[PDB]
Amino acid sequence: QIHSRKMNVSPDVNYEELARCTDDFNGAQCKAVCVEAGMIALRRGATELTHEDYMEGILEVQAKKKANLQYYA
Amino acid sequence: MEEGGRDKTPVQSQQPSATAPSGADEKSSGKERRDAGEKDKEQELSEEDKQLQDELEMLVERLGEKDTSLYRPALEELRRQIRSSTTSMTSVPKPLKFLRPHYGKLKEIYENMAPGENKCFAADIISVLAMTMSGERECLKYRLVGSQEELASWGHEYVRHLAGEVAKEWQELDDAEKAQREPLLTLVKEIVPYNMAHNAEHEACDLLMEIEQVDMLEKDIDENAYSKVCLYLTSCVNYVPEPENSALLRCALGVFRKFSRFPEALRLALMLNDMELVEDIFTSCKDVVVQKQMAFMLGRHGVFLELSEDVEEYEDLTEIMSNVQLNSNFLALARELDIMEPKVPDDIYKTHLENNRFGGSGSQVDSARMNLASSFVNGFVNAAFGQDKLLTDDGNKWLYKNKDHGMLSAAASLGMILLWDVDGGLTQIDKYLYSSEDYIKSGALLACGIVNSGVRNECDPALALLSDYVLHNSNTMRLGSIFGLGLAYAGSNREDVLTLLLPVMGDSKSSMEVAGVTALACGMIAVGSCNGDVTSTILQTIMEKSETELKDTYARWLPLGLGLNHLGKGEAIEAILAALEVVSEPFRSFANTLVDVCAYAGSGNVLKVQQLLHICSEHFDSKEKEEDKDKKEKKDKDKKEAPADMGAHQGVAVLGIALIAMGEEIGAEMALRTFGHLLRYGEPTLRRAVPLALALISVSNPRLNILDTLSKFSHDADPEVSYNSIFAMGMVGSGTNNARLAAMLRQLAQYHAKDPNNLFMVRLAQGLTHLGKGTLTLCPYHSDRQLMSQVAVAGLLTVLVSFLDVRNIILGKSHYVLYGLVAAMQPRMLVTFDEELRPLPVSVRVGQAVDVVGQAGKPKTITGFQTHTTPVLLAHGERAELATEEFLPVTPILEG
Amino acid sequence: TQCRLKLLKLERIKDYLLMEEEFIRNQEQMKPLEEKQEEERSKVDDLRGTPMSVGTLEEIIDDNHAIVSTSVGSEHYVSILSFVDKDLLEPGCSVLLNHKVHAVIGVLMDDTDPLVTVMKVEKAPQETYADIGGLDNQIQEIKESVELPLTHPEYYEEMGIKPPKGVILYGPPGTGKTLLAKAVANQTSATFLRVVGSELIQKYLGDGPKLVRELFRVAEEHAPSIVFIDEIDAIGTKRYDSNSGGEREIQRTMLELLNQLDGFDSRGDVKVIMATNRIETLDPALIRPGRIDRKIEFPLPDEKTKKRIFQIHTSRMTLADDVTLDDLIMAKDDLSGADIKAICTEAGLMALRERRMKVTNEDFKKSKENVLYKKQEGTPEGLYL
Amino acid sequence: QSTYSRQIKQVEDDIQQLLKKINELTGIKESDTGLAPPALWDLAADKQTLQSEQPLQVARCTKIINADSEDPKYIINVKQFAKFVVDLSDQVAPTDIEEGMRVGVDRNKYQIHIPLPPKIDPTVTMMQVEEKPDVTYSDVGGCKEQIEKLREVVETPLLHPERFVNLGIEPPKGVLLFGPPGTGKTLCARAVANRTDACFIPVIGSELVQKYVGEGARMVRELFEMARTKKACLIFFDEIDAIGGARFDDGAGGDNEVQRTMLELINQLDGFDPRGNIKVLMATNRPDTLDPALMRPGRLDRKIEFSLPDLEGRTHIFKIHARSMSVERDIRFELLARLCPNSTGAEIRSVCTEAGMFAIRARRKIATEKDFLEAVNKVIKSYAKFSATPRYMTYN
Amino acid sequence: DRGVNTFSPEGRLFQVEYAIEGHKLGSTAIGIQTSEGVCLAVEKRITSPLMEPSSIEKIVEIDAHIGCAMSGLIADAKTLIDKARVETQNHWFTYNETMTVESVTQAVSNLALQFGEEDADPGAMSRPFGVALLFGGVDEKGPQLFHMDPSGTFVQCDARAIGSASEGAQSSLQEVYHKSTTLKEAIKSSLIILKQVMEEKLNATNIELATVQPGQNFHMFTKEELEEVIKDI
Amino acid sequence: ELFVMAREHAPSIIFMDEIDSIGSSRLEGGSGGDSEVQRTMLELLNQLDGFEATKNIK
């Protein structure tokens, strides 16, 4: 709620809403995903945020070395 | 050794076979030597053929190994055998065959021993052998390039052979086109460009260009190899005199203008000094390559790139001539015409002012020597063109207040500050031209010459305005007008400019003493083009010296003009000389002597020899004194020769001052004073050291005026690195105060050096190569030898007018902005094999914006991996563009 | 080619003659060099005087000052003396300071350390090239990697790759891995620096990575170079527990060599030939492809390769018909190059015990037993075969 | 010509004889003078010589307590570690010297002329530093998926903080780059560094460890701070298991010297202060040695794993490398890469390098099929077993 | 140290990640399913033609109406196929219908991953398979081709290629094959791709061909028919 | 550096000592601290200058 005032946050998903499906996460984690979600959006050239920017955000935190979710389909 | 291998049938002998030609073979050595002579050819012909195949095979096997112990003695022993009598005499087919591996054997010796003797000997054998074999050398090289393996050693060896052909010791045109040079250029860029440069093999490369462009693009750097051929060619003056090289540069210039890489062509036209050549460089690019691309564009772009001296377009031989060819070139008549007009190159300079800011803090303060001091200072802070506009607009303080010669001096320096205005500076000069005494109007005229060059290109010319002005009955106004004329044209050949010089200063009887500068202005037009050949300048100088040599200023200027009018050519001087003889005096005998020196001048070894038989260290009265300093400088020559010869010139420049001091004691003070300008003309490879060393000492020695001369070069690259140097100089000047007269010279020095940040640097180089000519450096250069420089002479001396244009980035596909554009930097350099000195187009990405520099900027290149392209204009940013040539007619490299 | 030699010569003639001409002539005529030229010579010479303290130039500061640390136990932020240049003091070189008031009089010394002396090793070997027989293929591989880009770097850097560097020498130990680096080094004519991998970890704390920097820096300056690093296998195999630097020391050393090699440094002309036992006992940080393009695995030396090496040693040894080469080679199995060397060295030694200066078939037969046991020993192996 | 040749041999003796006259005038050896910049500097220089400004002894000011007898005094502790109470030489004000700031004092007359620049005491760290290097962009594989992810965090605030404030997003801090040797943590970092065109200081931690415990720690804090002050700085910390190792002791050894420095780095990145907009990148050789303080978001917002370059990455490294090279184009560059097993980035490139070498060896203007097959069959067998990755990956 | 049985910091298993790259060292499997049969082409993976083609097996009959071609780590594959033969046959035996290609595929996919150095014994795995199989056969519904990979994903395929470059083998398919096409083109479309995915030549001793078709069992191509198909590129 | 200096005062003996009661805390791991010193010395000693076929430092 404090964060939404400063930068845009999508109707589609809020970190609170996101947490329910997943599990618990720490407060630094919640702000970091959020800044990162904006980062994709800034890069595109939009001030608006989408749901994809946040989901991409979870993926941005994880490690990668074979980048495939069609083997982990 | 290990006898037998191939002359033995068992399975085992294959190992000794590689080794064996080092000591001796059973029959294989003998096949070419013993067996061929002793027996008759036809009986022998069956055996030799079988064995021939096996020697070929051994060559391939030796390349398989990496060892030199097995490579070198093995091929050497085989040679001797071939030489004896399988050279041309066996038959029609058999000599072609024997000759094919013979070439291979030869390369290693040619390449390895470097000496002059070895060099000539190999050419003798190679040429006769080439003719008989008739083209087998070409297949041989190509097979070797393919191979399966070879040695690193061999890489150097195969190119070296191409040099035997170029000499033509037994050739004259038969196999004087390729030894398969093309793959050979690609692999290695080293010995092969020298061979090409001398042969005139360089013609074939245009036909080959279509294939080569792929390799030049992203795969290799074939581009480096051709730029090298050009280095060797210009260097050839130093190697062997100017008359010998002159024929050569003409044939080299035609192949390069036809080639896609335009800067190389541009350098050579600039050296020859001819009207015909310039129009061809402009037109040829467009015609050879019909595709729009860069090709149409390269003609204009090369003229803008050319930076040697003066204002827009610079040389200005080229500006008049490129019209008529303009209509034919047809990118569009309306647009091409507008780009060529100096009105478009003026606008961009306006933007650079903003960046530079005010530097002005100088005196404009009234009364005394300070009023005279003020006028030179206002320009000197913002040298070339900067934000000095406020001060220039203000008429009242500086211009009007001066008295006598001071008024002419005040007006004359004004034009140089107003430099590169279409108009609005012209409004300003015209307003003075009408007002006040004769001194204001005449002074106004040099200044007029400067601003009006802005609207030209054969529509409303600079010539048009100046033509009315010259007519003036008063000596002073007419002088200032011709001086103004000379300044605009710089070094051109044109019917009108020559015609205005023909009657003017038709007497040695003149009221003022600055009448002599007429002769200089005329002298300037002659160099940097086809000579002026004006009668007034030649005839008058001998009469002037006979009435008077009492005025040190007057006496000096007329023979200085004579020595410059003759420069540019040897041939032309003969017509004017022929006239002079009609009037005979003792004075004339000396005039004649100067013509010998003038024709011979610019040679790399002739000129040097002449200086034992000198006109320094002699006075015949004081006749000898006037030109003796001029000879010693060799200043044209120093600029003219390659980047490689600059390293040498740094000693030469100093050497010439030393020479004057030794010869003539009085001449010693003068020599030091010339020095500051000598370096300015020279634009040496390393600029930092020389002026600073001089700068401190020049306070102690009589005539503080040396220090003023020093300051012109001394600021070097404008303050980033120079911040320490410009601050220290200014302090040395300001620190010592002993008189108002001394203060003023030192005050000129302080203020010149002290230039605000990011400003146009001291240059007469091209900004790819330190190649060029100077006929604008000449206007101070001449007046820096006048014994105890007057107020009147100071005025002539003040103008810069030669410094950089702000655009050092894309001209491209029609851009002409200062607005940023990306560039690539190579942290890992390989190249020192490009004359211009641009490292690989494989690129690592970095940010936008290349702005004026003097020295450095060599690793700075333009990206050519972002969408894969190769630079036509070899990029450094000094006055080198970040522009590329690709198939497409629009830059795939988009503005940052 | 010849014409070029004249151009190069052209710069150099002017440099000696000009310096000579100017110094003497210009003090004589007017006031150019004159009072100023004497003044620099004299002032520096007087200030320097007796004594001068030696210091080392740590850093140069842009404001006519420098950080010199002096060999008197005090550091100084000196002021430059009139007529001495700040920018002629190399960070490689130590500078001389006047010891009364600290200002840089000048550089008469660059000074020297025992630290330099380790990296620089001069080779003039008893066995060299054409003193090795057999295993001919293995030498050709080394050369394509080391010799060919080092001699002619121009194509190799130009094509787009970084130049292929070095070789890794592994397989059965004893093949003659050490002889090979020294022999190839003479042919290429590269400055041969030898430094042990175990020598880099030592008691001293923080000296360990500094030394590795020096090893690379010196190799680079020398110009064509090969660094043969003998027994590098050593850092990995042992966690020494005898250094006060500890496990910390081993870590920090291991990274620095990687940094100096390529890294962000990306030094060129420096080939490293690595001698190891095996590269399966070597540390996994160090090993990785693409710093060393080619790896060579020697086969077990056969009976055939062995004869050629022995003929050379027989030539170096006392000559007789009592030298019986074949018998010793045959008896032995498919085993190292080293043994051929060991049989010859033990045979001479053995002679001295007898009070004989002769090396005969008897010394050799006795030598065969000891060499064979020590190296690998055939009587275990005969059961398994 | 013959005359000219004689001079080649001669010039060497001629320079040696002349050598005392060269030395005085140009520089080095007897009477070192440059003649070009110390000449210009000479008038300013005379002021310093006259004064006791030589010596001006290395020190740092502890506290600026003024006291009586000579009024303007400062309490200084020299870098060799003993304190002097000193005086002010008139040439600056007492304002110029400030507590904690580096200052110059004489040794013969103890007094401040000009204060010494603060915090530039490491020379060792500077040794390694090359600003903006990179082998060439072509070996990278150009734009990989790996490069693009790295730019969002890294490039973008340095280039424009304006866009960050506008949207209202906090600016990032840390990117942790990890993988066993040769997966290119440093190669990618150099590529982004050049692009952003921020000043670039990369440093190995192994020189910010020196002498005993605590000296290395002083070097790390001062360096970091200095960079932080500087607007638009990018610091790529190269290979830290030398200021980045495990935290323990067992009381038969101890990791301490390493941990003092590591902890000093970690502390400094965000700070106990909000954060700056100056970026830190850490390259680590183990993901197994890291303590949680380093891992917190705002000193490490997203973890990016450059370990064993991705499925897309293996083919891009070969083709972009192949593009640059003169090679055959009837072979599928991707087939050669695909053959490569579990390839580290260094390993993919190893094929290209070995392939090209054979081609150079021949001296062809391309390459042939044979050069590629010998290279690739060799790489799959031997190199892969002998990579960094089998041993390291299981551990990690 | 920790296992290969542990998760990576990516949140994916270490051992499964390694297995796919392992496939790429070896043989290829190309199966094209047409409505006139399912064809399997696989490389014998030779060093010389002087290697008898009398009884090199890598396309083996699972059932007499289902064939299987293998790709990847060839050694690991030999035991997976031998095993696959008994389980399909237990199913054939009980149901007494002609087995469906999809039932054989699902059954073998759970055996791929049972790995672990705990909760496993000698008959269970301690490593994941890195064998990707192509099961091709004709059933009651008609011709079907199924792809199995180490992650157990089973999918219906009309053309699937996996090989030495898995990626490589597939990119060529798009280019040559088109949905509805004859049997004779289907065999040919495999020989053109086969080369692309191999780094090795077209020899009759280096390719192996088998067709399973309506009303017709798994057939092994002989030297003459191996040549007919080599001719068709 | 030691070999050189030892050469100046030739013949010399570099001595290495184990008794395993002094330096008993340097016997583990690498298996003797004295062993590292030996390994390094012999290897450089093997070839430097013309000193492989001459010996005066043991």
Swiss-Prot record, chain B:
Keywords: Acetylation, Phosphoprotein, Proteasome, Repeat. One of its GO terms (biological process) is proteasome-mediated ubiquitin-dependent protein catabolic process. One of its GO terms (cellular component) is proteasome regulatory particle, base subcomplex. InterPro entries: 26S_Psome_Rpn1, ARM-like, ARM-type_fold, Proteasome/cyclosome_rpt, RPN1_C, RPN1_N. The modification Phosphotyrosine is found at Y194. SUPFAM superfamilies: ARM repeat (SSF48371). Residues 24-51, 623-643 have a biased composition (Basic and acidic residues). The modification Phosphothreonine is found at T9. Residues 708-896 are annotated as: Required for interaction with UBLCP1. Signal peptide: none annotated. Residues 1-51, 623-645 are annotated as: Disordered. PC repeats lie at residues 409-442, 443-479, 480-514, 517-551, 560-589, 692-723, 742-757. The modification N6-acetyllysine is found at K551. The modification Phosphoserine is found at S29, S147, S361, S363. Residues 10-20 have a biased composition (Polar residues). GO terms for molecular function: enzyme regulator activity. Pfam families: PC_rep, RPN1_C, RPN1_RPN2_N. The modification N-acetylmethionine is found at M1. Belongs to the proteasome subunit S2 family. Component of the 26S proteasome, a multiprotein complex involved in the ATP-dependent degradation of ubiquitinated proteins. This complex plays a key role in the maintenance of protein homeostasis by removing misfolded or damaged proteins, which could impair cellular functions, and by removing proteins whose functions are no longer required. Therefore, the proteasome participates in numerous cellular processes, including cell cycle progression, apoptosis, or DNA damage repair. Binds to the intracellular domain of tumor necrosis factor type 1 receptor. The binding domain of TRAP1 and TRAP2 resides outside the death domain of TNFR1. This is 26S proteasome non-ATPase regulatory subunit 2. It comes from Rattus norvegicus (Rat). The gene is Psmd2.
From Swiss-Prot, chain D:
It holds the Pfam family AAA_lid_3. ATP binds at G179, P180, P181, G182, T183, G184, K185, T186. The keyword Phosphoprotein applies. The keyword Nucleus does not apply. One of its GO terms (biological process) is proteasome-mediated ubiquitin-dependent protein catabolic process. Component of the 26S proteasome, a multiprotein complex involved in the ATP-dependent degradation of ubiquitinated proteins. This complex plays a key role in the maintenance of protein homeostasis by removing misfolded or damaged proteins, which could impair cellular functions, and by removing proteins whose functions are no longer required. Therefore, the proteasome participates in numerous cellular processes, including cell cycle progression, apoptosis, or DNA damage repair. This is 26S proteasome regulatory subunit 7. It comes from Rattus norvegicus. The gene is Psmc2.
From Swiss-Prot, chain E:
SUPFAM superfamilies: N-terminal nucleophile aminohydrolases (Ntn hydrolases) (SSF56235). GO terms for biological process: proteasome-mediated ubiquitin-dependent protein catabolic process. CDD domains: proteasome_alpha_type_5 (cd03753). It is found in: Cytoplasm; Nucleus. The modification Phosphothreonine is found at T47. InterPro entries: Ntn_hydrolases_N, Proteasome_alpha, Proteasome_alpha-type, Proteasome_alpha_type_5, Proteasome_asu_N, Proteasome_sua/b. Pfam families: Proteasome, Proteasome_A_N. Keywords: Acetylation, Cytoplasm, Glycoprotein, Nucleus, Phosphoprotein, Proteasome. Its main location: cytoplasm. PROSITE patterns: PROTEASOME_ALPHA_1, PROTEASOME_ALPHA_2. One of its GO terms (cellular component) is proteasome core complex, alpha-subunit complex. Coiled coil: none annotated. The modification Phosphoserine is found at S8, S48, S55. Glycans are attached at S190. Belongs to the peptidase T1A family. The 26S proteasome consists of a 20S proteasome core and two 19S regulatory subunits. The 20S proteasome core is a barrel-shaped complex made of 28 subunits that are arranged in four stacked rings. The two outer rings are each formed by seven alpha subunits, and the two inner rings are formed by seven beta subunits. The proteolytic activity is exerted by three beta-subunits PSMB5, PSMB6 and PSMB7. PSMA5 interacts directly with the PSMG1-PSMG2 heterodimer which promotes 20S proteasome assembly. This is Proteasome subunit alpha type-5.
Curated annotation (Swiss-Prot), chain F:
It is found in: Cytoplasm; Nucleus. Transmembrane segments: none annotated. It comes from the Eukaryota. Belongs to the AAA ATPase family. Component of the 19S proteasome regulatory particle complex. The 26S proteasome consists of a 20S core particle (CP) and two 19S regulatory subunits (RP). The regulatory particle is made of a lid composed of 9 subunits, a base containing 6 ATPases including PSMC5 and few additional components. Component of a complex with USP49 and RUVBL1. Interacts with PRPF19. Interacts with TRIM5. Interacts with NDC80. Interacts with PAAF1. Interacts, in vitro, with the thyroid hormone receptor (in a thyroid hormone T3-dependent manner) and with retinoid X receptor (RXR). Interacts with ERCC6. Component of the 26S proteasome, a multiprotein complex involved in the ATP-dependent degradation of ubiquitinated proteins. This complex plays a key role in the maintenance of protein homeostasis by removing misfolded or damaged proteins, which could impair cellular functions, and by removing proteins whose functions are no longer required. Therefore, the proteasome participates in numerous cellular processes, including cell cycle progression, apoptosis, or DNA damage repair. This is 26S proteasome regulatory subunit 8. It comes from Rattus norvegicus (Rat). The chain holds residues 233 to 290 of 406 of the full protein.
